Design a protein around this ligand. Structure first.
Ligand SMILES: CCCCCCCCCCCCC/C=C/[C@@H](O)[C@@H](N)CO
Ligand SMILES: CCCCCCCCCCCCC/C=C/[C@@H](O)[C@@H](N)CO
Lengths: 236, 270, 283, 40, 236, 72, 216, 59, 67, 40
């Protein structure tokens, strides 16, 4: 007769507890494993793959056009696009990164922002991508943007530029929650030179934007996402 | 030969000299230092201007009268408009720094009076309206002029020159000296790094402050790491015939200053 | 009064010290330096030898902040849900914005320091009562769900949010108790007890520790459906710090508090220092 | 002995034994000896 | 099937118990520690730092004057101040020492009582600080005080005198509770000679008093303090 | 492929003078997990078990900007 | 284990009541081992005793008046050492027990905990031939040294439609015992806590013989 | 999850039982022992000391 | 931003990288290949050395589907 | 240590530690080096 004393919390059901339990099917032999391609071990692996950002979210309904960033010919200092860096909201909410980030409460690390040109091969352009750390609002002109982290991109044989959004923060982790006071900062693109279209070509050309996490990315405290809901249980 | 009363501090192109000192306090026995790799988070290479910012800056002098209650400065706020340091403060989103504070106040061997010079980390102020009101940026970031507690104090209850910047206006801090502007008692302020300027003994106080924070680096315009307070404990007593006032001067020098996250100038209220 | 001697690994409280007539005067100093000289009794009077027989374990910060303290008392109800448009106002479920500043006893202990880092041990006690007409008392099960910032907030007591697929939650009987640990979860290297800084939302300016206190909420509900009577369930949350680290001691709170997060005190408050019956010479 | 995977689950840490008040009582730059004149 | 027997107290919640419990956040990785100055390990460390005593608590409201002990010129045998030694009450209740002592039920050890002169450098005085062990009431004159533990202080270049209140007790521990019959005793200050002010100087000068614990100090049995209270829970 | 069985629930006791409502909640926790081929996360609400169907006349899932593509 | 105290608390409507202690909504016990005579006599066989304590608290309920059912209740026992704020109401702020140790357990159930030797001296005194001075009254005897705290008890639950009577029994058991100076055992009945007083006009304690000194 | 079976008498309070229990005062340091004369270890020691018999109980 | 260093079995989050002027351009690529080049911050800005102090245990599929 | 006959009864498996995103981020036939031109 071993003397015992049950502690507070005895008999509770903590959905997060990790204990052993009796098997309802003793001696059962599960089907053997076969080799299946594409094994995933960690969610940090898959967020390193970039997905398209619906940067042009100015439409009344969801469309392919939401992913197309317009580029106009013969314009000098103007802005191409802009966005705050709340990775749990805005244009990022529906991306793979944004979706996985929403399952966690804290984040940290650097982001990978890519831009792919889709205009004619005989066209040219130079753009300046800028990342503005928090403290000063979003840049209102190229001169303001150029003062922060930036990359001058020359469109050529290599169609994609990969700008990085370096982890620039005092506190070592940030909240995934968009209802917070401040985020990673701002992102903007400006005409460094201008888009020059070749003869016999007219109209707008487009940029495609991508987002992914660098190998230094961190995610903590699992939580439920606000991207899915239901009012009644589903039936067959 | 040498004594604790005579000291010289040289930072950059500036030098402080004192012949009536009372040793010098190094907060928690920790000298300032640069952020080591092992504690770093932000990946950007930091900027260390060195001698162009790590030098002595003298603020406007204060007048200590018999009705004085005390003065309060916030760092790095107090130096936000000071030379290259101030400029760097506005262009960067992040920064960290230590300091060497030097409070001055001379008199004669006929004078009496005692000042408490204390450095308080994370000095969260209370609101004048009380209850559930928050202090507005302007009043919590007073600049090089600091906060004059004599505008509405605790001890003898006066209203010196003002009640606040303009007057008792929505969002001002409670100026009760005896309650340290935060609901604690003045006499217990000694648990924080401090020195006394006892007129009969010394005429200066020197405190060296290392970077104190729960994060490796931080926003300098939205956060005040330490608060410097100069409070008269034993009132000023001047000899017969003399002017019943004495000037007090504060000189601060940033140490081991680092800046990071450079972009355009910061947008702050007011 | 030095610290070490051979017998029983005993520390000496006071050394044997006889008469003195020297130029070395330990009892004279200068407090303006900001230092407190370690003057012992053997420096001013003749002393005998005594031993400590004491380690000072009960004053260790681990012990000081290491006991359970009530940090919150909330209230939920079990009654007919029909007709109600606001389940939270009807108390069918209730949420607690997590913080250790609501109840003053523990708040004052924590505020003795500036930064603190520790793991948390929570104990939740649920009790019931029936203030109105009842033929019997029902056994009820309570669900406490942690809703971190960013996670969907429950709008109804039987919402889809209560599925808790990713949010951690506990289920236990009323009358019983719940217990779990939580590792240090601050974004920084330590929690802040005070914060001399503010934030900007383009709308309102927030100042103080409230800016950093952005933990989640704790949503509570009775899992059972309603009975013929109404049941009042009080829920008490207790907190206990473990593996404590503390930095920068402060001047203890002297005046009463007025709100969570703020260091405000009430205006027209009573004096905190006792006034003497006689004069400064009275005993 | 060992039945918990997370360190946060364990009980109290125990006494530090390395309690030195120096950083609070004597945070002065120049060494101040007891017995010697406070300020020369 | 291990045979067991639950002991009395099984299922109880002792707020003072120290046991293990399941983690609600498995696999969570806490933020790394960085070096922060001013680490505290024991409360016995911080009570060794002296804080001002509101010795002159004769005012209708709390003020700086509460800390100023008046010193009058040209007076011979008179008393400067006096106080009983109930460290949990009176003038000590609000000091750092008094505040921490109130979190504990028992105390023991020696106290450090300091006095700092703030008058003109060209003034002089000699005072006698006396500690009177319990048994005989507070001293009514200097002759009575001089018979107990005392220090004759000569005001000079060194502005502070540090008198010690040696642990003088039969029982090895005392109650922190002020509602007890007897305390450590009495403390008093007398003019040993007199305060002589230099020419062109007039009025009162002041003394500042400090209190702290010696390294031999002991504190036992944690308890709630009667210095804080509330009638309703605080809200945002 | 989903052809697992069913779970039958019942109150073992016979009836009392009154009626008793018993709700039964089933919880699932995966252990020793292995996963293959990551996918694009669900964006639209579900309509039925097993099917990837979404409702017709459904609200847009991507947030529309208050200003234009240049807004912050 | 020996019963050292029996107290009583109630669960009823708190509205209108100006004294929660007199209404029995909560009750405190000035800790001492002299109230109940059985253990008192055993301890008093010695002059000084040093030991650790093991306490067991049993709480039981009853409903003397009209009731449709019996409610499950939780009791809180809080140790209030001398100097700590005393509870004035059953739902005071003092019940937060941030520093005071306290136990929560079900009525009908039991509570158990150890307490290390907590005397100021090297041993507890069973007797004390000394007094104290408060400038008001002179106190003599062991009462002068017996200055432990109090134990505050309360029902945590709010009121039901009926009234519930909860009796609380405290039991004490000495562990790791050391005793000094054996004494002459108590012969006469006691009259009060702490005092060695006996009642006047008390019955003879030595048995009188039926016959004479030569009888068997 | 260690499989267990509570025995009869589980949860009982036997005033004579000798088991361990949690301390309500963790880390508390009791006053040191000093030498006090007249230590008693066993009641069989003290009954060896003779006391007067009220043999003439005829009053 | 490489993965291994000696002290405490610490993984580096970012390496110390100074100014550059090369013909090796890591920030230019072709996304039409279907690959995501592992571009780190040290490839586009000047960086200091930092350590991970993180294993990524909470994002393991065992934990993600394990509640 | 050992009180269950079936492996399904045991608790969580623990971290893999062998997380390589290559098969997702760089599933290309010809080796693509960072720094080298994407397409020659
Ligand atoms: C099953 C539910 C799991 C719930 C886990 C989340 C609870 C979070 C606990 C954090 C406790 C707050 C820590 C902050 C302490 C500060 O308030 C004090 N240092 C200052 O007052
Ligand atoms: C969770 C509540 C914890 C309560 C801990 C405090 C209880 C104190 C126990 C001390 C017991 C009294 C010891 C004195 C014994 C003497 O009365 C006898 N030797 C003489 O009658």
């Amino acid at each position: 007769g071993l003397p015992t004393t049950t502690l507070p919390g005895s008999g509770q059901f903590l959905t997060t507890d990790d204990r052993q339990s009796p098997s309802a099917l003793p001696n059962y032999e599960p089907t053997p494993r076969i080799h299946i391609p594409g094994k995933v071990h960690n969610l940090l692996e898959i967020i390193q793959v970039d997905t398209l950002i619906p940067m042009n979210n100015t439409h009344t309904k969801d469309e392919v056009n939401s992913y197309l960033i317009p580029l106009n010919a013969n314009r000098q200092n103007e802005q191409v696009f802009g966005t705050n860096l709340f990775i749990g909201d805005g244009v990022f909410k529906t991306t793979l990164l944004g979706e996985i980030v929403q399952y966690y409460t804290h984040w940290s690390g650097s982001l990978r922002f890519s831009l792919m040109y889709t205009g004619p091969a005989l066209s040219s352009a130079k753009l300046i991508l800028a990342y503005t750390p928090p403290g000063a609002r979003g840049p209102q002109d190229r001169r303001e943007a150029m003062l922060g982290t930036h990359v001058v991109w020359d469109i050529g044989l290599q169609s994609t530029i990969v700008m990085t959004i370096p982890w620039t923060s005092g506190v070592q982790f940030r909240y995934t929650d968009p209802d917070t006071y401040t985020s990673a900062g701002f992102l903007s693109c400006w005409y460094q030179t201008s888009l020059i279209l070749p003869p016999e070509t007219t109209g707008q050309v487009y940029l495609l934007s991508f987002i992914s996490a660098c190998p230094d990315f961190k995610l903590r405290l699992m939580k439920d996402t606000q991207t899915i809901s239901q009012t009644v249980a589903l039936t067959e | 030969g040498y004594s604790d009363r005579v000291q010289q501090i040289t930072l950059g192109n500036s030098t402080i000299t004192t012949q009536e000192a009372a040793n010098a306090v190094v907060c928690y026995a920790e000298w300032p230092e640069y952020l080591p790799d092992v504690d770093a988070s932000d990946v950007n290479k930091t900027s260390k201007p060195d001698t162009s910012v790590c030098r002595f800056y003298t603020l406007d002098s204060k007048t200590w009268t018999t009705g004085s209650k005390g003065w309060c400065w916030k760092l790095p706020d107090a130096l936000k408009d000071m030379g290259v340091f101030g400029q760097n403060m506005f262009f960067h989103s992040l920064g960290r720094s230590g300091y060497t504070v030097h409070v001055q106040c001379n008199a004669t061997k006929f004078h009496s009076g005692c000042l408490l010079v204390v450095v308080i980390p994370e000095h969260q102020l209370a609101s004048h309206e009380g209850g559930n009101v928050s202090v507005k940026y302007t009043f919590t970031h007073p600049g090089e002029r600091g906060i004059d507690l004599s505008s509405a104090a605790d001890t003898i209850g006066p209203g010196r020159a003002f009640y606040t910047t303009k007057n008792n206006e929505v969002g001002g801090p409670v100026k009760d000296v005896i309650y340290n502007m935060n609901g604690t008692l003045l006499g217990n302020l000694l648990i924080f790094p401090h020195q006394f300027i006892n007129l009969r003994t010394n005429n200066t106080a020197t405190i060296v402050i290392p970077y104190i924070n729960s994060v490796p680096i931080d926003s300098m315009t939205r956060h005040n790491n330490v608060s410097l307070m100069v409070i008269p404990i034993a009132p000023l007593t001047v000899p017969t015939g003399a002017t019943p006032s004495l000037p007090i001067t504060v000189t601060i020098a940033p140490m081991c200053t680092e800046f990071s996250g450079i972009r355009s100038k910061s947008i702050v209220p007011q | 009064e030095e610290v070490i001697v051979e017998k029983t690994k005993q520390t000496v409280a006071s050394i044997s010290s006889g008469p003195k007539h020297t130029q070395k005067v330990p009892i004279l100093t200068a407090n303006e330096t900001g230092a407190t000289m370690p003057v012992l009794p053997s420096d001013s009077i003749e002393t005998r030898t005594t031993y400590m027989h004491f380690n000072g374990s009960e004053t260790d910060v681990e012990c000081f902040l290491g006991r359970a303290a009530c940090v919150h008392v909330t209230e939920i109800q079990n009654k007919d849900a029909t007709g109600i448009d606001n389940h939270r106002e009807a108390k069918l479920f209730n949420d607690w914005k997590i913080n250790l500043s609501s109840l003053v006893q523990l708040r004052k202990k924590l505020e003795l320091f500036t930064y603190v880092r520790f793991d948390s041990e929570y104990t939740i006690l649920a009790t019931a009562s029936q203030p109105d007409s009842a033929n019997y008392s029902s056994n009820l099960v309570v669900q406490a769900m942690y809703v971190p910032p960013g996670a969907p907030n429950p709008k109804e007591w039987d919402d889809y949010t209560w599925q808790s697929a990713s949010n951690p939650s506990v289920f236990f009987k009323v009358g019983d108790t719940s217990r779990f640990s939580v590792p240090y979860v601050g974004l920084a290297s330590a929690y802040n007890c005070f914060y001399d800084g503010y934030s900007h939302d383009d709308a309102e300016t927030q100042y103080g520790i409230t800016v950093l206190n952005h933990m989640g909420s704790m949503a509570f509900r009775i899992v059972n459906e309603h009975d013929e009577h109404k049941t009042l369930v009080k829920i008490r949350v207790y907190h206990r710090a473990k593996h404590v680290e503390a930095w920068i001691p402060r001047a203890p709170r002297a005046l009463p508090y007025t709100s969570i997060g703020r260091t405000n005190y009430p205006k027209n408050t009573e004096p905190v220092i006792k006034k003497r019956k006689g004069d400064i010479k009275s005993y | 002995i060992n039945y918990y995977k997370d360190a946060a689950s364990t009980s109290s840490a125990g006494q530090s034994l390395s309690m030195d008040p120096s950083k609070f009582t004597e945070p002065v730059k120049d060494l101040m000896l007891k017995g010697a004149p406070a300020l020369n």
